[PDB]
Design a protein around this ligand. Structure first.
Ligand SMILES: CCCCCCCCCCCCCCCCCC(=O)OC[C@H](COP(=O)(O)OCCN)OC(=O)CCCCCCCCCCCCCCCCC
Ligand SMILES: CCCCCCCCCCCCCCCCCC(=O)OC[C@H](COP(=O)(O)OCCN)OC(=O)CCCCCCCCCCCCCCCCC
Ligand SMILES: CN(C)[C@@H]1C(=O)C(C(N)=O)=C(O)[C@@]2(O)C(=O)C3=C(O)c4c(O)c(NC(=O)CN5CCCC5)cc(F)c4C[C@H]3C[C@@H]12
Lengths: 240, 192, 468, 144, 48, 48, 48
């Protein structure tokens, strides 16, 4: 206690009096730091500012912090409250949702235009059925290599939606024409179609895969940004 | 074995023994290095007119050439074969016995009368109400020249006289080490 | 930032005024957390910071409640708050990892080693000129100004004569004025600290140095005034070096409607004027996110060259030809023209500086190259096979164009409708989406109206030069 | 302690800088010397350099650097840290009803909250605003 | 050497523990102070 | 290989008789003959 | 993975610093209720 510190003995006078610490100093319990004054909405407050360790997922870290804090809250003194004054994760979550909505919209629009050109529901369903397969397989493959779900890889997926349905559109369109041209059964007609269009399929795939390949070999921050688009798109085209 | 990992582990162990070392040893400094890569070239800096001593050259290589060369495109390490100046107090025994002084007395006066003074700030953090100014107070105290060391005070004589360092010793700028003498083509030199 | 020698009370008063302004902007601002005595530059009493949370995006949907509108409104606190050096409302960079604030980051170096006075002289010229450029706003130093300082000069000879140990005076003055942590004590099961320092009234002014005494070897007490004088000086509180050279740091922002590249260009124009004004031998470097911007922009030509090369070589490998690859790569300009034209027009008729030559534009350009190659290959591989089967070059090429027109156009429209949602997006990162979408969709349009016409003509020309 | 900014730059910042010239994937160095007596040197690295390898290498060079420093500096200690500039979050602690004092809130944040939060997974560093309790002994030079 | 368990806790264990922040991958810490004068602090890390 | 060396032999007894502590004798020899580093000074902006 | 085989390693923490006597008393109340009520065999405190 401060009283004990007030009583520390210091020296003795020639007359005989005993000099204590209170005789020369003022003792009180104060701060160990007097260089900051923090307020919240104009009212006195205390602040903790957290920085992430390099290599950590911000959303994960923020969830863990809120968990630990909610645990700690149970022993607050009467009258203590807290509140996030500055926080970045709302924007991150919002922008992920933004990209996902635009991806769904992309799919719907592509289906509509394919219907505009393939006038039937049967013809229309085949290139549509390709989308789930290629999207989900691409996620599986790129996760094998450590790529996450971020804004860039989702942009790549949206950009790919309109390329992955290509080989399918070519195939289905050749079948429909062949079936119309010589009226033959779907099975025979299809065998004839593939024999016609295999070279075009390979050429399409080769060019679209090749354009995005050199991108994956640049260094720096720019190379890291590039690799997302590169790897995602390459996997999408091979899978298609 | 990863040489960087081996080096950090060794110096980490070395922390555990530093406190047992002698103070004199401790103050000099215990350094840890790994082997790594070898010499590409050695540059010799010399005085072809025998105008500069090896020590000044060494001191000159260390204070002037070292840091510009370290920044060159592909340089890993730059090392000098030698050091820089020191202030040198050379004591006389008979003079010390005249004034009844000891080497420890001179040492105490040197450590007492050569220091840096830290102060603080004007208007420091828990300031008074209405405080108007905040500034830093710096106090220059360390000595710089042989004349200042010569003029250090030691004691007074019985007959009210003043006895300074210069009365028992020869103050001098000299080398931090005297154990080696190096020449290039026969004349004073320092190696990089 | 506050002028030199400014105390915590004055910094806090500026913050009180500054706080209310944000607090009164009720349709835009949720809360503000402020700290006096702390800044990103460093810790001093004349620095301070504010963290300002705006209301939710759902509510701030009118023009008045946009982040940039508030930034402009706050940029008048410089004019109204008169005790501060500057009060700067700033934004986070797109990637908060890569920086601390949005803007440019410039290091002014003293290449010729002229000195701190000359370096400051150059910096002040730079700031003066940048004040007059209409393309820049908020250009400021990011480092502490030169300040008055109190210099004590201790008279060693007098102290030695008086019996005073310079180490002893160090100890006493250090503890009294600066404070010193001695040892720990326990409070509720936790170890805390004990400090000893002079009382506040004794350590405010230089005249209080005359209240402190030092014990000499005889043990008597001689005042600090006996062997110390004191003087006011002028000096630098914080020297900086960038890349082993003395330097200063300048930061700013582009004015509304101006790109980051244009801000950097304006700054470099300004810096070039220095020698003409007599100040010679100063260099600069771009650091931070500006350094990343320059490096990303530098390498687009090499990305384009490499992608075109690989397309050429794979197409040569797949069709065992040299003429077919040249025909294919000859129509890449027509795809690329739409991408650039639509991007530029969108920037001009939307006034958006984000629609520009950036990383997203670069990936869009590679994508457009790919689409153009795809369309070409579709027509030409069928033309070539028709010629091998036995058919005039023109008959083969016209037939192939006729036969493939339908799949080419429906695939190109599929791609173009895929990316249209990006161009029409809103909120939460719509700038990046706009760059990608505008580039790719423009490319799709020129490829559909210009490219298909040019594929057969280039094919027939090339194949007429190199027959069979 | 006690040195002018120029003395700091000449005697500390420059020698440590010279030692760091020659790290593996170094991109640029930024340093400042302050007149309270402090020196700060921030080393930036190329993209793809491993943070832990960079830290160990910086320590390996600092080991030999630290003998070339003034003996008082040596006594003070040198620290090596890896951290980023941007704050992920800021939490505000306050008394809505003004029935717990500010000294108490500040102390409570420092004694019961700061350490457990700085040990959550992913958190790299915590910056606290407002100090903890201390025993303050304010001296009267007249009575001394 | 020579210290009671309480002395070891106040003058060594808490002093050493108050720097054990900022460690990447840490799960928990167990410390003890014994009356023979020994302080032990065990730091446990996540897998990997 | 081993080389001649010189050993100093100080009678503790005479020193005690003569009023000199063994510690004083040790320190005198140490500084006089061995040399000693005391502290630093800043010559032209560099520490020596 | 442990000094000796055992299950349900529980740790009782003295949050808000009550003291050692209080912590022991709280532990003792716990240990008393553990034996007396249900589904518990051999509940004991570990250290000295
Ligand atoms: C047929 C060639 C098709 C060229 C496609 C257009 C590529 C392009 O964007 O041209 C401009 C580019 C520099 O682009 P810029 O952003 O201004 O960087 C400075 O300029 C370039 O990079 C020229 C690339 C030419 C590569 C030739 C293939 C080998
Ligand atoms: C404009 C186009 C002019 C170039 C061109 O069309 O080449 C055609 C020519 C004949 O091609 P082809 O008949 O297929 O054998 O092709 C040739 O005869 C020579 C072309 C050789 C190209 C070598 C390029 C290698 C580049 C990678 C390095
Ligand atoms: C010069 N060059 C042609 C040689 C060469 O050609 C070859 C080669 N090509 O192989 C060699 O090996 C060399 O590089 C080499 O080995 C040497 C050193 O190490 C070294 C040393 O370490 C210390 N040690 C110290 O402490 C000195 N400090 C100064 C301040 C206090 C003490 C002192 C010292 F004279 C040397 C000499 C060099 C010689 C050098």
């Amino acid at each position: 206690t401060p009283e004990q510190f007030k009583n520390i003995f210091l020296k003795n006078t020639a007359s005989g009096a005993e000099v204590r610490l209170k005789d020369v100093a003022r003792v009180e319990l104060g701060s160990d730091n007097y260089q900051f004054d923090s307020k919240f909405n104009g009212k006195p407050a205390a602040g903790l500012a957290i920085k992430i360790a390099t290599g950590a997922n911000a959303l994960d870290t923020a969830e863990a912090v809120e968990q630990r804090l909610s645990e700690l809250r149970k022993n607050y003194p009467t009258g203590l409250a807290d509140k996030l004054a500055y926080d970045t994760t709302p924007f991150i979550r919002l922008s992920i949702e933004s990209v996902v909505h635009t991806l769904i919209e992309a799919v719907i629009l592509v289906f509509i235009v394919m219907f505009l050109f393939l006038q039937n529901w049967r013809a229309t369903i085949i290139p549509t059925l390709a989308v789930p397969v290629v999207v989900l397989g691409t996620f599986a493959v790129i996760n094998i290599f450590g790529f996450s779900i971020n804004t860039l890889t989702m942009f790549a997926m949206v950009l790919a939606i309109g390329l992955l349905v290509d080989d399918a559109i070519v195939v289905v369109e050749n079948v429909e024409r062949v079936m119309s041209e010589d009226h033959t059964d779907p099975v025979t007609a299809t065998s004839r179609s593939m024999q016609q269009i295999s070279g075009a399929l390979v050429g399409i795939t080769s060019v679209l895969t090749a354009v995005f390949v050199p991108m994956a070999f640049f260094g720096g921050t720019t190379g890291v940004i590039y690799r997302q688009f590169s790897i995602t798109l390459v996997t999408a085209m091979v899978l298609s | 074995v990863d040489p960087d990992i081996a080096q950090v582990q060794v110096q980490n162990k070395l922390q555990s023994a530093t406190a047992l070392l002698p103070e004199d040893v401790q103050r000099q400094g215990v350094t840890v290095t790994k082997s790594g890569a070898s010499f590409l070239q050695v540059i010799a800096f010399y005085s072809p007119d025998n105008n500069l001593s090896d020590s000044d050259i060494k001191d000159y290589v260390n204070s002037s050439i070292k840091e510009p060369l370290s920044r060159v495109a592909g340089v890993g390490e730059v090392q000098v074969f030698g050091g820089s100046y020191a202030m040198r107090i050379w004591l006389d025994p008979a003079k010390l016995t005249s004034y009844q002084l000891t080497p420890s007395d001179i040492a105490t006066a040197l450590q007492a009368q050569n220091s840096q003074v830290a102060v603080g700030q004007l208007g420091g953090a828990p300031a008074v109400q209405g405080q108007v100014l905040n500034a830093t107070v710096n106090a220059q105290s360390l000595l710089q020249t042989p004349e200042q060391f010569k003029n250090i005070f030691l004691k007074n004589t019985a007959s009210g006289a003043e006895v300074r360092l210069k009365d028992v010793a020869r103050v001098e700028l000299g080398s931090d080490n005297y154990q080696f003498d190096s020449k290039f083509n026969g004349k004073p030199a320092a190696g990089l | 930032q506050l002028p030199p020698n400014a105390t915590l009370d004055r910094t806090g008063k500026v913050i009180d005024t500054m706080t209310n302004f944000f607090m009164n902007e009720k349709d835009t601002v949720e809360s503000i957390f402020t700290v006096s005595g702390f800044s990103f530059t460093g810790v001093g009493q004349n620095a301070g910071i504010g963290f300002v949370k705006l209301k939710d995006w759902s509510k701030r949907t009118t023009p008045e409640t946009q982040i940039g509108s508030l930034i402009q409104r706050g940029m008048a606190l410089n004019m109204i708050i008169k005790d501060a050096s500057y009060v700067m409302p700033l934004q986070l960079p797109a990637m908060p990892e890569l920086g601390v604030t949005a803007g440019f980051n410039l290091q002014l170096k003293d290449s010729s080693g002229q000195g701190h006075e000359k370096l400051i002289a150059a910096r002040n010229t730079i700031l003066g000129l940048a004040s007059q450029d209409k393309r820049l706003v908020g250009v400021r130093p990011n480092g502490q100004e030169d300040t008055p300082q109190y210099q004590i000069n201790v008279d060693q000879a007098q102290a030695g004569a008086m019996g005073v140990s310079i180490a002893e005076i160090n100890n006493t003055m250090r503890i009294a004025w600066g404070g010193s942590y001695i040892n720990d004590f326990v409070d509720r099961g936790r170890v805390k600290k004990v400090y000893v320092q002079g009382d506040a009234g004794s350590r405010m002014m230089p005249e209080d140095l005359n209240k402190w005494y030092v014990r000499n070897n005889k043990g008597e007490m001689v005042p600090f005034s006996a062997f110390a004088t004191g003087e006011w000086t002028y000096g630098s509180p914080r020297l900086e070096r960038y890349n082993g050279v003395s330097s200063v740091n300048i930061q700013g922002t582009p004015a509304p409607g101006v790109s980051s590249g244009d801000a950097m260009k304006a700054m470099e124009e300004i810096i070039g004027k220095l020698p003409s004004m007599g100040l010679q031998g100063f260099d600069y470097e771009w650091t931070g996110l500006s350094l990343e911007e320059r490096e990303s922009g530098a390498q687009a030509p090499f990305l384009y060259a490499l992608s075109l090369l690989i397309v050429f070589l794979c197409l040569a490998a797949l069709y065992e030809s040299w003429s077919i690859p040249f025909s294919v790569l000859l129509v890449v300009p027509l795809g690329v023209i739409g991408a650039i034209v639509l991007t530029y027009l969108g920037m001009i008729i939307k006034g958006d500086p984000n629609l520009s030559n950036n990383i997203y534009f670069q990936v869009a350009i590679i994508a457009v190259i790919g689409l153009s190659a795809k369309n070409a290959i579709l027509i030409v591989e069928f033309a070539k096979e028709l010629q091998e089967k036995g058919e005039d070059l023109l008959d083969a090429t016209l037939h192939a164009a006729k036969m493939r027109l339908r799949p080419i156009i429906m695939t190109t429209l599929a791609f173009g409708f895929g990316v249209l949602p990006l161009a029409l997006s809103t909120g939460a990162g719509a700038g990046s989406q706009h760059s990608v979408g505008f580039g790719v969709l423009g490319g799709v349009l020129s490829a559909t109206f210009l490219g298909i016409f040019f594929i057969p003509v280039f094919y027939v020309w090339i194949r007429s030069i190199f027959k069979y | 302690p006690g040195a002018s900014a120029e003395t700091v730059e000449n005697t500390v910042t420059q020698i440590i800088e010279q030692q760091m010239n020659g790290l593996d994937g170094l991109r640029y160095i930024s340093s400042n010397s302050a007149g309270n007596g402090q020196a700060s040197i921030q080393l930036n690295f190329e993209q793809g350099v491993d943070p832990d390898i960079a830290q160990v290498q910086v320590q390996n060079k600092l080991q030999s650097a630290t003998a070339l420093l003034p003996e008082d500096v040596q006594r003070q200690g040198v620290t090596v840290t890896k951290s980023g500039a941007s704050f992920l979050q800021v939490i505000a602690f306050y008394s809505p009803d003004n029935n717990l004092s500010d000294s108490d809130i500040k102390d409570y944040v420092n004694s019961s909250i700061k350490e457990p939060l700085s040990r959550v997974a992913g958190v790299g560093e915590v910056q606290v605003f407002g100090g903890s309790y201390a025993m303050r002994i304010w001296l009267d030079p007249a009575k001394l």
